[PDB]
Short mmCIF file of N, CA and C in Angstrom, two decimals:
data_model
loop_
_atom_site.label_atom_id
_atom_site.label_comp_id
_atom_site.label_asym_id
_atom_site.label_seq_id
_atom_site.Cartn_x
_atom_site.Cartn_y
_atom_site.Cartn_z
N UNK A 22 -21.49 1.85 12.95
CA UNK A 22 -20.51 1.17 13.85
C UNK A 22 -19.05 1.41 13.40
N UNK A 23 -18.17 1.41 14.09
CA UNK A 23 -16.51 1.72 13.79
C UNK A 23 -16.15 0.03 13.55
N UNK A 24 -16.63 -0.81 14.02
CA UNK A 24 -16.74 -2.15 13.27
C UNK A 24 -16.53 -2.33 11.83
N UNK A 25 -17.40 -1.35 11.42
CA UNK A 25 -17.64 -1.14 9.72
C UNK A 25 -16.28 -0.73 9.40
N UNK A 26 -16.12 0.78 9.75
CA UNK A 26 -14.74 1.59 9.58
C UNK A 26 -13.47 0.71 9.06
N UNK A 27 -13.49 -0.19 10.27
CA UNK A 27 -12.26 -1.01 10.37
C UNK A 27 -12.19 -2.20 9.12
N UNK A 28 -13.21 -2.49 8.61
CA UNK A 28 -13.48 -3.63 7.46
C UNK A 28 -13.24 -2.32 6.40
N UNK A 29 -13.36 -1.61 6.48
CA UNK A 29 -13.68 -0.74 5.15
C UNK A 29 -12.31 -0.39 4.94
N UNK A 30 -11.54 -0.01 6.00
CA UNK A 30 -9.96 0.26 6.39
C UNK A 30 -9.35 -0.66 5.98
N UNK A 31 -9.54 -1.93 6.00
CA UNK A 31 -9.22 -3.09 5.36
C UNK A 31 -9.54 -3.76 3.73
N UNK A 32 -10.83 -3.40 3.51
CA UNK A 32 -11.13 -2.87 2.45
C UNK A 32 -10.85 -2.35 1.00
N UNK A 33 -10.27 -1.06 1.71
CA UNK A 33 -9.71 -0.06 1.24
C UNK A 33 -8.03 -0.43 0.71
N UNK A 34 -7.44 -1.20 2.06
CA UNK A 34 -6.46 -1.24 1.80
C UNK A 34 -5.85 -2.82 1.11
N UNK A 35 -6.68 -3.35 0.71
CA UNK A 35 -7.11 -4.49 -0.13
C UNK A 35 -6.90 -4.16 -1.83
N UNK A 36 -7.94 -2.90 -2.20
CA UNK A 36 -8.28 -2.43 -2.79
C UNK A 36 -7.11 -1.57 -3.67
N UNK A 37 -6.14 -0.51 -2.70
CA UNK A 37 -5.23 -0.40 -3.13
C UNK A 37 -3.44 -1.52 -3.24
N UNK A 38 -4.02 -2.24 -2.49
CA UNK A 38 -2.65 -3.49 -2.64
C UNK A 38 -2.96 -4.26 -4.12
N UNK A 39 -4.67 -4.36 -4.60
CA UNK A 39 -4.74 -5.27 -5.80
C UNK A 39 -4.76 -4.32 -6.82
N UNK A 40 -4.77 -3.01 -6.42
CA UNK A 40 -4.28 -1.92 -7.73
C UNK A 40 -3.02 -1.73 -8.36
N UNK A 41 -2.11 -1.64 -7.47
CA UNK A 41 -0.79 -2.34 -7.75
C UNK A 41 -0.66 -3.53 -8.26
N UNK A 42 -0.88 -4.66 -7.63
CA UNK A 42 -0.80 -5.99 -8.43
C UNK A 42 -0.68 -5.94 -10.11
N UNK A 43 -2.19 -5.47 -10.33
CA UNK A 43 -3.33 -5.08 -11.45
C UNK A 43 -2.25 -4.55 -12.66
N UNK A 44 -1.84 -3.50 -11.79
CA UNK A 44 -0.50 -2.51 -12.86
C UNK A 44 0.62 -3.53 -13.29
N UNK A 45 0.97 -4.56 -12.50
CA UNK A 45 2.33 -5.39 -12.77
C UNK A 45 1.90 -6.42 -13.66
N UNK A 46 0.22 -6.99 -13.65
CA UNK A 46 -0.02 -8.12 -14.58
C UNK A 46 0.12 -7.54 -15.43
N UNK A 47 -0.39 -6.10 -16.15
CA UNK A 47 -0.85 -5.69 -17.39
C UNK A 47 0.31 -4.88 -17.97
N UNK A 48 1.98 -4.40 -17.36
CA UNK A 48 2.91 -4.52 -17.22
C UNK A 48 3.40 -5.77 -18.10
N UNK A 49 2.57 -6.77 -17.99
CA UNK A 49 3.34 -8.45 -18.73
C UNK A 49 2.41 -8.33 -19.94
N UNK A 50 1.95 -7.08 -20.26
CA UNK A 50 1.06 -7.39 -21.66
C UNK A 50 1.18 -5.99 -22.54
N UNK A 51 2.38 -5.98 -22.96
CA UNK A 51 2.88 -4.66 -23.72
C UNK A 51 1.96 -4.13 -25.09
N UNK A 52 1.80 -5.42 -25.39
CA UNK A 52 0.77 -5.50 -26.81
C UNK A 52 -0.63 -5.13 -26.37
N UNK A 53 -0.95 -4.69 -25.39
CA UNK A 53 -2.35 -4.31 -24.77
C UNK A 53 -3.52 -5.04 -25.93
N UNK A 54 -3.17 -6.46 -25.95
CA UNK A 54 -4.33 -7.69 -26.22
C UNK A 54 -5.48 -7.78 -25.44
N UNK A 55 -5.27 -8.13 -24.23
CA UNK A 55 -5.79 -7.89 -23.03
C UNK A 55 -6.67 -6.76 -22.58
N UNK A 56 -6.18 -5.56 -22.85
CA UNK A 56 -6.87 -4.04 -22.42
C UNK A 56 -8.31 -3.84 -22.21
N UNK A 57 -8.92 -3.99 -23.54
CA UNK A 57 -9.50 -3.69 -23.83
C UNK A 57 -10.96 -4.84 -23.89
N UNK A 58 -12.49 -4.61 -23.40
CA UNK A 58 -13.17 -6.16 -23.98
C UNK A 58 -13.29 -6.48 -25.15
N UNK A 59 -13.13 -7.69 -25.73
CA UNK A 59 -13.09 -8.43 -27.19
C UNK A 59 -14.57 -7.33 -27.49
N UNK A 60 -14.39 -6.85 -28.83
CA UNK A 60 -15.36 -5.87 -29.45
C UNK A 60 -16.39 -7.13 -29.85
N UNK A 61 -17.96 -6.60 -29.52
CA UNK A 61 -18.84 -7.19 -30.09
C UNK A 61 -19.42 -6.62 -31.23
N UNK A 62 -19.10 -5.31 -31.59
CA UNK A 62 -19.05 -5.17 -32.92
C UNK A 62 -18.31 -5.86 -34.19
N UNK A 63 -16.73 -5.77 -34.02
CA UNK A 63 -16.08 -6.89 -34.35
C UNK A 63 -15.71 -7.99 -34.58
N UNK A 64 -16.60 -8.61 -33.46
CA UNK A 64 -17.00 -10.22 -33.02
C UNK A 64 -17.80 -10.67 -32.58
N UNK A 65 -19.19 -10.14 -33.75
CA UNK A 65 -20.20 -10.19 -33.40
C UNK A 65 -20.75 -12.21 -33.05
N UNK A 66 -20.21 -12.96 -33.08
CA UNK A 66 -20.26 -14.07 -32.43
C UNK A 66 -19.87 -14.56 -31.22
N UNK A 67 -18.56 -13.75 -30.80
CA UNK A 67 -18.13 -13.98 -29.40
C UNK A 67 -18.47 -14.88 -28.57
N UNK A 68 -19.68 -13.66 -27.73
CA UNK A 68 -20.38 -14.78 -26.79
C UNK A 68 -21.04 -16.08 -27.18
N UNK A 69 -21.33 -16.19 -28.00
CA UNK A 69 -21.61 -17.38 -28.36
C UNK A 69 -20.27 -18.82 -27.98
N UNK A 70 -19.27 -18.30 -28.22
CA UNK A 70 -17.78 -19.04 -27.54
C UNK A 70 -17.85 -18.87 -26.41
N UNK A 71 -17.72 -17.66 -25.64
CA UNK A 71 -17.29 -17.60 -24.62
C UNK A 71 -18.58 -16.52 -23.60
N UNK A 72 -18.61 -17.15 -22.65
CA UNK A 72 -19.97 -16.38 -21.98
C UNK A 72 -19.88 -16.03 -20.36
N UNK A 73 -18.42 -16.01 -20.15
CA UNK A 73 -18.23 -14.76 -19.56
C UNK A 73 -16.14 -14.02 -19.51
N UNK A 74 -16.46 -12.65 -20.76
CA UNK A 74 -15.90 -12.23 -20.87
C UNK A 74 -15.03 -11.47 -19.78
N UNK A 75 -13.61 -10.96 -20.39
CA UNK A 75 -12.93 -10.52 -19.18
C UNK A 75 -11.64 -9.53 -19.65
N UNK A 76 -11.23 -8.62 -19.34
CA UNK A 76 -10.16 -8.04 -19.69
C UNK A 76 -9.56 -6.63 -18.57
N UNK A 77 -8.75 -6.66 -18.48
CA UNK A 77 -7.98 -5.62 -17.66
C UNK A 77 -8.62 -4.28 -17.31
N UNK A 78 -9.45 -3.93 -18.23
CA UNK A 78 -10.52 -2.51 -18.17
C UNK A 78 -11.46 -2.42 -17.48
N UNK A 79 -12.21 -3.39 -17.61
CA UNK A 79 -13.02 -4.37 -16.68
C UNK A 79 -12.61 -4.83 -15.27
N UNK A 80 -11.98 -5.10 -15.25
CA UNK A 80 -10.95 -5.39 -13.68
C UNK A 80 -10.54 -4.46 -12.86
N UNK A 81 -10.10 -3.31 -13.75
CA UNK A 81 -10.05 -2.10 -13.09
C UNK A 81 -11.53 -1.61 -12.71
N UNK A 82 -12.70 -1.39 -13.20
CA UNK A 82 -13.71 -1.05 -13.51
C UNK A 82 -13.90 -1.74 -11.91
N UNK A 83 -14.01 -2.99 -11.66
CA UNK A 83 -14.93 -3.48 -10.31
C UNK A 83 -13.57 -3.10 -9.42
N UNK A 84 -12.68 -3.42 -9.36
CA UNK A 84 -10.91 -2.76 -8.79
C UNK A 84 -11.50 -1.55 -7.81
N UNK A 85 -12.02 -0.15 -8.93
CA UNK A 85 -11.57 0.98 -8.27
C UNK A 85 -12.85 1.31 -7.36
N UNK A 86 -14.42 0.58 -7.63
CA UNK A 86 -15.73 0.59 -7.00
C UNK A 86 -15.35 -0.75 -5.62
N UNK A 87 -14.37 -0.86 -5.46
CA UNK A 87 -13.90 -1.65 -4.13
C UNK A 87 -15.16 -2.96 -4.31
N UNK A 88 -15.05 -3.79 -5.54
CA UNK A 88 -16.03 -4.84 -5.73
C UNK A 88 -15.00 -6.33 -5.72
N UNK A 89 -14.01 -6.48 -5.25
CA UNK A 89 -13.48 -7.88 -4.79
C UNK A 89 -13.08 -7.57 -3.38
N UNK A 90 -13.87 -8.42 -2.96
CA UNK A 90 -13.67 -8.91 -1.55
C UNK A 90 -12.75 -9.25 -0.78
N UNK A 91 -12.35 -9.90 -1.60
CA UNK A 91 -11.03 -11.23 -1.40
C UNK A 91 -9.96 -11.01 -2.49
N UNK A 92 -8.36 -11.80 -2.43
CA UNK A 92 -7.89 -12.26 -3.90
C UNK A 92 -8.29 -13.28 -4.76
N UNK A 93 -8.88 -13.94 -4.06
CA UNK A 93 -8.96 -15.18 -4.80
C UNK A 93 -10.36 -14.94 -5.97
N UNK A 94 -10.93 -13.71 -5.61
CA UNK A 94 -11.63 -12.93 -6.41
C UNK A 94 -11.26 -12.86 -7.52
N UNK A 95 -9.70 -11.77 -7.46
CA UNK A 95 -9.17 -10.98 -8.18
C UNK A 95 -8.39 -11.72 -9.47
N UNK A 96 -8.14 -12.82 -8.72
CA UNK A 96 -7.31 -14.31 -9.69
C UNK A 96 -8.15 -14.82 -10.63
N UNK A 97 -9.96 -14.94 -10.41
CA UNK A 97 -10.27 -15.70 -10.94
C UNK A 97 -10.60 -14.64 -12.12
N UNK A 98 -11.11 -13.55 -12.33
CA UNK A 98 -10.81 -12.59 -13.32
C UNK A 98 -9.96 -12.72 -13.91
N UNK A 99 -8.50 -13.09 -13.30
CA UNK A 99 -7.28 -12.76 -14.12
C UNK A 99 -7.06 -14.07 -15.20
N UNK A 100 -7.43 -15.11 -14.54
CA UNK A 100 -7.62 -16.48 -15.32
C UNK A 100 -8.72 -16.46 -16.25
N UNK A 101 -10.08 -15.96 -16.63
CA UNK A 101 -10.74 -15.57 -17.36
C UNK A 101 -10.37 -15.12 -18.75
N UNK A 102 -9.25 -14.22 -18.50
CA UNK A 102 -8.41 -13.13 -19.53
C UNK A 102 -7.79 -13.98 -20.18
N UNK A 103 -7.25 -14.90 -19.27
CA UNK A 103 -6.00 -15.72 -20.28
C UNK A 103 -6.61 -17.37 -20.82
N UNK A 104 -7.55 -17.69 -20.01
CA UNK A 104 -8.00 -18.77 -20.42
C UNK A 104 -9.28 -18.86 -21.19
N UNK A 105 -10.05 -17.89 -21.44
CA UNK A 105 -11.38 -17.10 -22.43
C UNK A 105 -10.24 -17.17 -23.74
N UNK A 106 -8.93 -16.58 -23.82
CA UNK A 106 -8.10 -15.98 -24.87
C UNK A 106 -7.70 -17.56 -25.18
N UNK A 107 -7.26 -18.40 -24.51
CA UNK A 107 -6.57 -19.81 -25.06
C UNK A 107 -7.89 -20.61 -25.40
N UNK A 108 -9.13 -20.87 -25.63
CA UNK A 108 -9.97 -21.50 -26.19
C UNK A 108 -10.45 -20.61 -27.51
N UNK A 109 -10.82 -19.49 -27.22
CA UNK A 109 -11.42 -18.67 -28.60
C UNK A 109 -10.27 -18.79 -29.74
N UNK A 110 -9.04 -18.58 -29.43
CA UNK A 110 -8.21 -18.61 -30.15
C UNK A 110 -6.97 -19.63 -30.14
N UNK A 111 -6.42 -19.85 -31.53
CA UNK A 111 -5.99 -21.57 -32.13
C UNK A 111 -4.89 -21.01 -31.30
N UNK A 112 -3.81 -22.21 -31.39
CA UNK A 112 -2.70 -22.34 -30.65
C UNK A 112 -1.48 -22.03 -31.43
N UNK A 113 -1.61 -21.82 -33.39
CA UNK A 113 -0.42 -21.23 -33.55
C UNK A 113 -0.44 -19.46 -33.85
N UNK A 114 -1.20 -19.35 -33.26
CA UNK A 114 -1.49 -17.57 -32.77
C UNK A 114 -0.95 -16.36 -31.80
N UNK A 115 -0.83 -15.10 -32.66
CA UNK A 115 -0.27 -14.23 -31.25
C UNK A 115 -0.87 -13.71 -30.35
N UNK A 116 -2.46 -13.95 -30.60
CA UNK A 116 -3.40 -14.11 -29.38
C UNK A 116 -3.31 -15.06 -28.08
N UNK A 117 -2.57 -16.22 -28.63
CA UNK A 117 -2.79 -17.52 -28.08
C UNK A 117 -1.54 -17.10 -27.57
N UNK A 118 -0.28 -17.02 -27.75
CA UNK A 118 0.84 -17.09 -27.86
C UNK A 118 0.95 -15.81 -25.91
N UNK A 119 0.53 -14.88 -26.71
CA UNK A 119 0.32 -13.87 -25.57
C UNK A 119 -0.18 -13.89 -24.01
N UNK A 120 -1.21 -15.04 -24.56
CA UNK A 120 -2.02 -15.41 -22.86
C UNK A 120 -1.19 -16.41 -22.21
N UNK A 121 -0.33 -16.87 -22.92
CA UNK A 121 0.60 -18.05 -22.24
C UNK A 121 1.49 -17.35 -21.45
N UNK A 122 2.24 -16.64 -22.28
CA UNK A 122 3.40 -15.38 -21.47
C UNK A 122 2.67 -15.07 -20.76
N UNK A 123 1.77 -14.61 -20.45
CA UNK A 123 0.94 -13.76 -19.41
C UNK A 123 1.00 -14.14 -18.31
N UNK A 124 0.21 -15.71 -18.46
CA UNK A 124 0.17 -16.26 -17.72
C UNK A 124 1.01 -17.04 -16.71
N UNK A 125 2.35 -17.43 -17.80
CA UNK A 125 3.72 -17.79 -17.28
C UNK A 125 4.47 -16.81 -15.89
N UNK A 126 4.41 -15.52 -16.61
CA UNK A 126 4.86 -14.32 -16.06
C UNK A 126 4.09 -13.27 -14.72
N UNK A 127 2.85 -13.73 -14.89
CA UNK A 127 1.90 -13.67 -13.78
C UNK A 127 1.62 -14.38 -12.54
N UNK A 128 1.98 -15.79 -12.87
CA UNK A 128 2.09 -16.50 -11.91
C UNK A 128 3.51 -16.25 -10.75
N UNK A 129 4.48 -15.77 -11.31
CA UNK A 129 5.60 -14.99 -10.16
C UNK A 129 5.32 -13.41 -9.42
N UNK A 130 4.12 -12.35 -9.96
CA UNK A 130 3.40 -11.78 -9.53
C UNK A 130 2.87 -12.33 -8.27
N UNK A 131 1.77 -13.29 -8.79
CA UNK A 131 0.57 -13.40 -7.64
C UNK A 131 1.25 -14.66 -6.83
N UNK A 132 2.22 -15.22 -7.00
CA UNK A 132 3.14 -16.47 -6.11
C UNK A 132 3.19 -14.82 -4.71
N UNK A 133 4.02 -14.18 -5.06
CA UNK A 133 4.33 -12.80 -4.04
C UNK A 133 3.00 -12.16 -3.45
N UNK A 134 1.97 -11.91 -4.24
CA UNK A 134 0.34 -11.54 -4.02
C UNK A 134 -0.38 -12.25 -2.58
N UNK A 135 -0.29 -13.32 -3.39
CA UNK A 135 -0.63 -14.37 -2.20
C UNK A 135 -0.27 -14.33 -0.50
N UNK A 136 0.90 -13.94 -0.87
CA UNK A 136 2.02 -14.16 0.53
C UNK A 136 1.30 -12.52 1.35
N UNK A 137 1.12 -11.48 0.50
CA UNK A 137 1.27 -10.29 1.03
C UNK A 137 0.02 -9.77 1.50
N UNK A 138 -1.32 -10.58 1.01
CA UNK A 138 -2.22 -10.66 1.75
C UNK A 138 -2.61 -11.83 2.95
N UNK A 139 -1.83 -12.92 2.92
CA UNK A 139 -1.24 -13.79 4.20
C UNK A 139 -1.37 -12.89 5.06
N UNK A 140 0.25 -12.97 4.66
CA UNK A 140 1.63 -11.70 6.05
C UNK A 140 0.35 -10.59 6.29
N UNK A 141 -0.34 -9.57 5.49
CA UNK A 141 -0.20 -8.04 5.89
C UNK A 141 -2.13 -8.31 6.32
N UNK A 142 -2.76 -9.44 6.45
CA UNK A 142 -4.00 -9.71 6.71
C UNK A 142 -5.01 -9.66 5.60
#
Protein backbone atom coordinates (compact mmCIF):
# COMPACT_ATOMS: atom_id res chain seq x y z
CA UNK A 1 0.00 0.00 0.00
CA UNK A 2 1.37 3.75 -0.58
CA UNK A 3 -0.40 4.12 2.89
CA UNK A 4 2.75 2.41 4.15
CA UNK A 5 5.10 4.70 1.88
CA UNK A 6 3.68 7.71 3.44
CA UNK A 7 4.25 6.46 7.31
CA UNK A 8 7.63 5.32 6.29
CA UNK A 9 8.13 8.97 4.60
CA UNK A 10 7.30 10.08 7.91
CA UNK A 11 9.26 7.66 9.48
CA UNK A 12 12.13 8.30 7.82
CA UNK A 13 11.86 11.76 8.32
CA UNK A 14 11.45 11.36 12.12
CA UNK A 15 14.40 9.36 12.01
CA UNK A 16 16.57 11.88 10.42
CA UNK A 17 15.13 15.02 12.56
CA UNK A 18 16.14 12.73 15.91
CA UNK A 19 19.63 12.22 14.27
CA UNK A 20 20.31 15.66 14.48
CA UNK A 21 18.85 16.18 17.86
CA UNK A 22 21.11 13.01 18.95
CA UNK A 23 24.36 15.02 17.55
CA UNK A 24 23.44 18.28 19.74
CA UNK A 25 22.78 16.16 23.11
CA UNK A 26 26.14 14.41 22.77
CA UNK A 27 27.61 17.86 21.56
CA UNK A 28 26.77 18.70 25.62
CA UNK A 29 29.09 15.77 26.54
CA UNK A 30 32.70 16.65 25.41
CA UNK A 31 34.16 14.19 27.97
CA UNK A 32 32.40 11.33 25.95
CA UNK A 33 31.19 9.76 29.62
CA UNK A 34 28.17 8.98 28.01
CA UNK A 35 29.52 7.36 24.56
CA UNK A 36 30.16 4.50 25.20
CA UNK A 37 27.99 1.36 27.44
CA UNK A 38 29.32 1.25 31.14
CA UNK A 39 31.95 -1.82 30.45
CA UNK A 40 30.85 -5.06 32.03
CA UNK A 41 34.16 -6.15 32.02
CA UNK A 42 35.11 -3.24 34.12
CA UNK A 43 31.99 -3.29 36.12
CA UNK A 44 31.50 -6.45 36.44
CA UNK A 45 28.58 -5.64 39.06
CA UNK A 46 26.76 -3.03 37.15
CA UNK A 47 23.67 -4.58 36.40
CA UNK A 48 23.18 -5.59 39.48
CA UNK A 49 22.60 -1.44 40.20
CA UNK A 50 21.18 -0.69 37.33
CA UNK A 51 19.06 -3.00 34.92
CA UNK A 52 18.47 -1.16 32.14
CA UNK A 53 21.49 0.39 30.73
CA UNK A 54 21.84 3.27 28.24
CA UNK A 55 24.31 5.40 26.39
CA UNK A 56 24.58 7.46 23.16
CA UNK A 57 26.04 4.35 21.01
CA UNK A 58 23.20 2.54 21.78
CA UNK A 59 20.78 5.29 20.80
CA UNK A 60 22.33 5.67 17.74
CA UNK A 61 22.31 1.88 17.27
CA UNK A 62 18.12 1.72 17.47
CA UNK A 63 18.33 5.77 15.84
CA UNK A 64 19.79 4.55 12.51
CA UNK A 65 17.51 0.84 12.27
CA UNK A 66 14.46 3.54 12.38
CA UNK A 67 13.44 1.76 15.99
CA UNK A 68 11.68 4.94 17.82
CA UNK A 69 8.49 5.54 16.81
CA UNK A 70 7.77 8.54 18.51
CA UNK A 71 9.99 11.29 20.66
CA UNK A 72 8.84 10.62 23.61
CA UNK A 73 10.68 7.33 22.81
CA UNK A 74 13.78 9.03 22.14
CA UNK A 75 13.63 11.14 25.65
CA UNK A 76 13.12 8.30 27.62
CA UNK A 77 16.57 6.78 26.47
CA UNK A 78 18.02 10.07 26.93
CA UNK A 79 16.85 10.18 30.67
CA UNK A 80 18.18 6.63 31.23
CA UNK A 81 21.84 8.04 30.38
CA UNK A 82 21.63 10.69 32.84
CA UNK A 83 19.56 9.28 35.49
CA UNK A 84 21.21 5.35 35.42
CA UNK A 85 24.61 7.86 35.78
CA UNK A 86 23.06 9.99 38.95
CA UNK A 87 22.16 6.79 41.12
CA UNK A 88 25.26 4.43 40.25
CA UNK A 89 27.35 7.24 40.96
CA UNK A 90 27.87 9.54 44.43
CA UNK A 91 27.11 13.14 44.07
CA UNK A 92 30.61 14.60 44.74
CA UNK A 93 31.72 13.06 41.35
CA UNK A 94 32.65 13.92 37.70
CA UNK A 95 30.43 11.22 36.65
CA UNK A 96 27.67 12.66 38.66
CA UNK A 97 28.66 16.14 38.03
CA UNK A 98 28.47 15.48 34.11
CA UNK A 99 24.87 14.00 33.91
CA UNK A 100 23.60 17.12 35.60
CA UNK A 101 25.16 19.49 32.86
CA UNK A 102 23.78 17.21 30.45
CA UNK A 103 20.87 17.23 31.55
CA UNK A 104 20.59 21.01 32.40
CA UNK A 105 21.80 21.72 28.82
CA UNK A 106 19.59 19.17 27.10
CA UNK A 107 16.60 20.20 28.32
CA UNK A 108 16.93 23.65 25.94
CA UNK A 109 17.62 21.07 23.05
CA UNK A 110 14.51 18.98 23.40
CA UNK A 111 12.26 22.29 24.92
CA UNK A 112 12.93 23.17 20.69
CA UNK A 113 12.58 19.09 19.81
CA UNK A 114 9.34 19.00 21.12
CA UNK A 115 7.95 22.03 19.27
CA UNK A 116 9.49 20.71 15.85
CA UNK A 117 7.82 17.53 15.88
CA UNK A 118 4.40 19.50 16.99
CA UNK A 119 4.80 22.24 14.10
CA UNK A 120 6.47 19.79 11.27
CA UNK A 121 3.94 16.56 12.32
Amino acid sequence: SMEQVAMELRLTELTRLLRSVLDQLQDKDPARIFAQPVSLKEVPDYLDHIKHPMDFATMRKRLEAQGYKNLHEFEEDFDLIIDNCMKYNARDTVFYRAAVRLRDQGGVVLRQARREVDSIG
